[PDB]
């Protein structure tokens, strides 16, 4: 089976370097040209670079010229993209793609693509989130059912995972996509809808896990009584 798999993406600070790799399997790598393509957030596909089948040739987009270097090792089925002097404007998912025709054919299409690897260039620093209860109320009670949740604040970088009652409660839950504050940190909210006639008789705890900072938090959410 033919397959391309990129590696080495992660979070980095501006000005630093990172080297990604793309390993082939299932076909004779030394017979094809390979390219890198990227897609920034909310933007379209952008061609980055390419290298010939035998490595004698290569070329770059004007937006990376001088900063990026492409190279391949025809003794290991692997290609590399050395990125230096990274900028926030280089943030993107990067893909490697093979052309359809062997050897020195030109203008050939990209038929096989890997799944891509994500690169985030930020000045933010790794931070576990603060978690607060979003207590249920008449203000948002008895539609017959009630809405309560957990607000997951100021963390970096994505992603966070939320579960309720440790997996046991799975219906009615709706976890919203995170917002990126201008401060460079993310925030998200997870809500659940429940029978308003059993509040207080039933216990609800949201389980928040933030892999990147090795922080897990459990938070019981309860109806106050102002």
């Amino acid at each position: 089976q033919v397959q391309l798999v990129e590696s080495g993406g992660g979070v980095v600070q501006p000005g630093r370097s990172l080297r990604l790799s793309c390993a082939a399997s299932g076909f004779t790598f030394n017979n094809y040209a390979i390219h890198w393509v990227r897609q920034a957030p909310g933007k379209g596909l952008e061609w980055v670079a390419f290298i010939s089948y035998d490595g004698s040739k290569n070329y770059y987009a004007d937006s990376v010229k001088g900063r990026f270097t492409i190279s391949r090792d025809n003794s290991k089925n692997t290609l590399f993209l050395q990125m230096n002097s990274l900028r926030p404007e280089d943030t993107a998912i990067y893909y490697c793609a093979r052309v359809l025709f062997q050897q020195l054919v030109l203008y050939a299409p990209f038929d096989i693509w890997g799944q891509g690897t994500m690169v985030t260039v930020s000045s933010a620093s790794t931070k576990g989130p603060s978690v607060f209860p979003l207590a249920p109320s008449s203000k948002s009670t008895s539609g017959g059912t009630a809405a309560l949740g957990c607000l997951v604040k100021d963390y970096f970088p994505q992603p966070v995972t939320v579960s309720w009652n440790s997996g046991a409660l799975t219906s009615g839950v709706h976890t919203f996509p995170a917002v990126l504050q201008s401060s460079g940190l993310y925030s998200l909210s997870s809500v659940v809808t429940v029978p308003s006639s059993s509040l207080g008789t039933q216990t609800y705890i949201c389980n928040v896990n933030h892999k990147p900072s090795n922080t897990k938090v459990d938070k019981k959410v309860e109806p106050k009584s102002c």
């Binding site: 379209g44 030109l106 919203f176 102002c226």
Partner: protein
């Protein structure tokens, strides 16, 4: 050097047929360079649809076809299906041998009934207040089409600063969800009689409100 322009978006209804153009110039398309088409849904890698203007790889269905004339190219899709909803890109080259992609066209497939959003607004929690901060959370979900306006108010004034709102994103049920956050100091929170999150969608406006322990 040069570019390839594509209409940002196109629509059609199921079973119908649509076309996606790619307009280039005397320097790419016009010079003989060929055009290839890719179909794309971000949670996936792109897929080659058509190559060298009119060629279709095996695996790719009948319904897709290409043409080219002068400095433009075009992609036709017949019998529109749901699964066809995605982004489509044309791609060519120039006299450098740098591949050049167009901006992308997102295709929308008509046919889904309009849906009013459910809006939920939460005031700050004591806990956050004890930590000397206050965050109001406005949650908006289950609406379609994916377009909505969000507005905040302190009593009757429009508040502009300290607001962060997500663009909406499609959920697994084909409807959209969006969020808006309003960051305040605990002094402002207690200084006003109420705060409101107002959401407008296709002629509908719903507004929810919260007030500091206006208990009673």
């Amino acid at each position: 050097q040069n570019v390839l322009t594509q209409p940002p978006s196109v629509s059609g209804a199921p079973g119908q047929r649509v076309t996606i153009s790619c307009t280039g110039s005397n320097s790419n398309i016009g010079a003989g360079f060929t055009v290839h088409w890719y179909q794309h849904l971000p949670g996936t890698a792109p897929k080659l649809l058509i190559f060298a203007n009119t060629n279709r790889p095996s695996g790719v269905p009948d319904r897709f076809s290409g043409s080219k004339s002068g400095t433009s190219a075009s992609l036709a899709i017949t019998g529109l299906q749901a699964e066809d909803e995605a982004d489509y890109y044309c791609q060519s080259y120039d006299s450098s041998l740098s591949a050049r992609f167009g901006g992308g066209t997102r295709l929308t497939v008509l046919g889904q009934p309009k849906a009013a959003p459910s809006v939920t607004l939460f005031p700050p929690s004591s806990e956050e207040l004890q930590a000397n901060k206050a965050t109001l959370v406005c949650l908006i979900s289950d609406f379609y089409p994916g377009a909505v306006t969000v507005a905040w108010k302190a009593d009757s004034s429009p508040v502009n600063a300290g607001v962060e709102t997500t663009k909406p994103s499609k959920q697994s049920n084909n409807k959209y969800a969006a969020s808006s956050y309003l960051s305040l100091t605990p002094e402002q929170w207690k200084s006003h009689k109420s705060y409101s999150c107002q959401v407008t969608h296709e002629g509908s406006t719903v507004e929810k409100t919260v007030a500091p322990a206006e208990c009673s």
